[PDB]
Structure formats: C-alpha cells, structure tokens
Design a protein around this ligand. Structure first.
Ligand SMILES: CN(C)c1ccc2c3c(cccc13)C(=O)N(CCNC(=O)CCCC[C@@H]1SC[C@@H]3NC(=O)N[C@@H]31)C2=O
Ligand SMILES: CN(C)c1ccc2c3c(cccc13)C(=O)N(CCNC(=O)CCCC[C@@H]1SC[C@@H]3NC(=O)N[C@@H]31)C2=O
Ligand SMILES: CN(C)c1ccc2c3c(cccc13)C(=O)N(CCNC(=O)CCCC[C@@H]1SC[C@@H]3NC(=O)N[C@@H]31)C2=O
Ligand SMILES: CN(C)c1ccc2c3c(cccc13)C(=O)N(CCNC(=O)CCCC[C@@H]1SC[C@@H]3NC(=O)N[C@@H]31)C2=O
Lengths: 124, 124, 124, 124
C-alpha cells in the first residue's frame, strides 16, 4: 500500500539508466528498463516481485526484478536480476545488487556471470 | 521455441526445492517456487524473463526470476533472484547464482544480502 | 611502483571502517582491518595481492584481500574477501565487492555467505 | 590445529585447477594456484586467512584467499578472491564463492567483476 505507492514510478541509477515500474497490490512488479550502458538499446521488459506487507520497524522493503536483454532492436543473449530493498522518504532509494548472466558454452560457463550494485533514486 | 519447450516444466535443485515454470513465447517466465529450506512454507509466486531467441552455437539460454517470500502462510520480508542459463539435452540443467535480500534497517543494510548457487534438473 | 605508492596507506570505507595496508614490490598486500560494524573489535590481520604492473591505458589496478574475523578479543567464525580495483588521483578510491562466509553446519551452508560492496577513500 | 592439518595440502576444483596451500598456526594461508582455464599459465602466488579456532559444533571453518593473475609468464590485470569454508572428514571439501575483478576504465567499471563458485576436493 504505502510501498505500492512508494515503489511505483520512474527511477534512475548512478549509470543514468531508467527503471519504470508499477507495483501491484498482489506483490507484482512490471515495467520497462533502459540501460545507459552495455549491449542495449531502448526499453526492455521487466518483471519481478516485492514484499507487499513489509515490517513496520523501519526496515526496507525487499524486492527483485529481471530483464532479459532481448527486444526488437537487439539481443545480448543475457539476463540481469536485481535484488535489493526499497527505502522510502524524502530521498527514497532502491538499493540493489545484481547478477548478469550471459548464455555461454559449457567450457565458458565459469565466466558467465557479472556481479555489481546499482542505487536507484527518484531524481537523477 | 525449442527452449520454451525445454524450460517449461517442473525443476528440482540440490536442496530439494521445487521450481514450476511456464516459459511464454514473449520471453516471460511464470510459476511457483517451493523451498525445501529457510523461512518458507508451500508455494510462492515467481516471475522472470528468458532469452526467447538464444544463440545456436551451443550456448546456454540466459534467464532469471524472482520470488518474494510472502504468501498466505508466511512473510519472510525477503526476495531472492536467480540469474543463470538453461542448458538443454538428455541431462538438461538450469545453472544459477542467486541473491537473497532481506528488508533491513539502514544500520543493518551491509548485512542484507545472501549469495549462493543452485543447480536445477528435471529429475531430482 | 606508482600503485605501490598509491595503495600503501590508511583507507576508510562508507561504514567508517579502517583499512591499513602496505603494498609490496612483489604484489603483496599486508596490514590490518578494523570494522565499524558487525561482530568485530579492534584490528584484524589482512593479507592479499594486487597487480604490480597494471595497464597504462587509464585502467584500474586489480586487487583483493582477506580478513578472518578472529583476533585476541573475538572470534566471529567467518572470513571476508574484498575484490576490486584501485583508481589513483586526487580522489583516489578502492572500489570493492566482498563475500563474507561464516562457518556453518552442512544443513545451513546455503545461507553461509553475505555479499556486499565497499568503497574506500583516503579521507573519510 | 585439526584444520591446520586438514587444510594444508593440494586441492583440486571442478575445472581441474590446482590449489596448493599451507595453513599456519596464526591463521595464515600461503601457497600457489594454477588455473585450468582463463588467461593464466603456470602457478600464481596466493595468500589468505582462515579461522584457526573454528566452532566445535560440526560447523565448517571459514577461510578466504586471493590470487593476482600476474606471474613471470602473463599478466591478466585481474584478481580473484575465494571466500568459503573447509569441511573435514573422509570426503573433505573446501566450498567457495569467488569474485574476479579486472582492472577497467571508469566507463567499464560496471562490468569489472565476475562471480562464480568452486568446490575443491583432495582427490580430483
Ligand atoms: C568476457 N567477459 C569477461 C565478459 C565481458 C563482457 C560481458 C560479459 C558478460 C557476461 C560474462 C562475461 C562477460 C555480460 O553479460 N556482458 C553484458 C551483456 N549484456 C548487456 O550488455 C546488456 C546490458 C546490461 C547492462 C547492465 S545490467 C546491470 C547494470 N545496470 C545498468 O543499468 N546497466 C548495467 C558483458 O558485456
Ligand atoms: C543475520 N544474517 C547473517 C542472516 C541470517 C539468516 C538470513 C539472512 C538473510 C539476509 C541477510 C542476512 C541473514 C536472509 O534473507 N535469510 C533468509 C530469509 N528468507 C527465507 O528464509 C526465505 C526462504 C529462502 C530460501 C532460499 S532462496 C535461495 C536458496 N534456494 C532454495 O531453493 N532455497 C534457498 C536468512 O535466513
Ligand atoms: C542468519 N543470517 C541471515 C546471517 C545473519 C548475520 C550474519 C550472517 C553471516 C553469514 C551468513 C548468514 C548470516 C555473517 O558472516 N555475519 C557476519 C559475522 N562476522 C562478522 O560480523 C565480522 C565483521 C564483518 C564486517 C563486514 S566485512 C564487509 C563489511 N565491510 C566492513 O568494513 N564491515 C563489514 C552475520 O552477521
Ligand atoms: C567482457 N566481459 C564480459 C568479460 C569477459 C571475460 C572476462 C571478464 C573479466 C572481468 C570482467 C568482465 C569480463 C575477467 O576478469 N576475466 C578473467 C581475466 N583473468 C583471467 O582469466 C585469469 C584466470 C582466472 C581463472 C578463474 S579464477 C575463478 C575460477 N576458478 C578457477 O580455478 N579458474 C577460474 C575474463 O576472462
């Protein structure tokens, strides 16, 4: 409810990427993502989930979402998942860690997956 | 197509958890997850994405999905994302890495996120 | 050489932790770490390695180090490894990702490892 | 003591890499690593730390180590850290997660770090 409202909207990360999400009453996340970097052009579908009844101790709201990097313009044969928590208030944030897996041969599977962290704000 | 067919079904990981997924023609993943471990009971909604047009060099198919650990029985104030690749054939596998974030206070945010790896097969 | 000089010293991360390191000519890192958070008191031994001949294209210098969280005051039955890169200049930084593993039972091994990111500066 | 003995020796992972380590009485790990894959040839220095007084409940022993991928033959401008736990007994194992950072430009820092998992045994 509070965080359905707080999460729904347009977010921006430190790279200049754009995350457009709707948080549903059932815990769904749906929207589009546009990366400022990488083998990417325009918007990509995203879907995910969030805790629709977080704790009321002042904890964050756990959430995550996935982008497969295929759309009408490109196919980067890869998928990113962001896992993190939403923190509400005047300077709301979504603080995330992500895993970006590329499809590989079996011989290259050891080097399939990048790891990083993205912080999203409502302003940038 | 090939991997819509190959991905859709029931999968099992090394912990004894059960992953029930439908891969759509558009790149969607939908289903339910049941963990054998942790603060979890019964099935949880999952949603994700996969590369619906993978390479044909013998590479894996990149995919990912999210579970928020809230259902009618429990709320563990946390979300897991799995990022990985599907590898088809007689002993098909989905090889994943995952990030499990709990909602935390700001003071505890440094210890919000677990990391691990799960391998899913069609048999176990 | 340049980065032996640049890396050797006292660093501080965003949590207020203190990283005291000597970079040797052979690629060694030695020193002590003091965490501002967690099950930790005072200084802990650290050892690691760095690229002692980085690229000269303006790339970072790859490095990593380990702390086992045992000293004369406490034993937290855990170890952290930081992996990252040093970036020199007026606002030098060491940008890292870390893995913090606790010793667990086999049944709890799935939840053994925390993941996070720390940015170190010469000032804070 | 028990794990000084148990950890010291030659280990092998699922890729066919060779990890030669000495565990000291003070918690030090020293040795050499030879990767079966990647931009690597021959042995590389490793250093790390382990919990020299683990719990006696049947928990694992937390440890970690670093390799910078520079030696007399090659320089891959990168460093790997493994974080994990040693589990003793007839089929002893070291179960690890790793982070492999390459030195990058600032513009490429988002894609600096690979993540994976290696399981080491005394036999393979
Ligand atoms: C050879 N070996 C070292 C690699 C070199 C480059 C790459 C990889 C990859 C996977 C595994 C290895 C490598 C990989 O998936 N890739 C990306 C492919 N896929 C893409 O480029 C799609 C855009 C991804 C944008 C990310 S999502 C997290 C972050 N947050 C944002 O807002 N934007 C960024 C590489 O380049
Ligand atoms: C205090 N500090 C060290 C922790 C101790 C325990 C925990 C945490 C967590 C997050 C951060 C820190 C801790 C966290 O999210 N948690 C889990 C809470 N949430 C749950 O238990 C929900 C079930 C999660 C099951 C996982 S999904 C990846 C894997 N694959 C499967 O098939 N099953 C497992 C902890 O316990
Ligand atoms: C139950 N389940 C969810 C957990 C809950 C709490 C914990 C864990 C752990 C491991 C696995 C699970 C959990 C774990 O290792 N632990 C830490 C134990 N060990 C310690 O507290 C030692 C200090 C570590 C300080 C870190 S190093 C990275 C960062 N950067 C800094 O400068 N300071 C921080 C937990 O609490
Ligand atoms: C372009 N983008 C997607 C990448 C593509 C390839 C690479 C990277 C890297 C870092 C970041 C991105 C990429 C990176 O560090 N690299 C490795 C460079 N460095 C090396 O190859 C040194 C050998 C590393 C061997 C590892 S250690 C963990 C594992 N366990 C073993 O026993 N052996 C393996 C890449 O290739």
């Amino acid at each position: 409810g509070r965080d359905e409202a707080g999460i729904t909207g347009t977010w921006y990360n430190q790279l200049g990427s754009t995350f457009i999400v709707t948080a549903g009453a059932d815990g769904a996340l749906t929207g589009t993502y546009e990366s400022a970097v990488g083998n990417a052009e325009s918007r990509y579908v995203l879907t995910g989930r969030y805790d629709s009844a977080p704790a009321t101790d002042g904890s964050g709201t756990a959430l995550g979402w996935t982008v497969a990097w295929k759309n009408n313009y490109r196919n980067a044969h890869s998928a990113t998942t962001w896992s993190g928590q939403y923190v509400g208030g005047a300077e709301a944030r979504i603080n995330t860690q992500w895993l970006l897996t590329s499809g590989t041969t079996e011989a290259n599977a050891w080097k399939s997956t990048l790891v990083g962290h993205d912080t999203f704000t409502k302003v940038k």
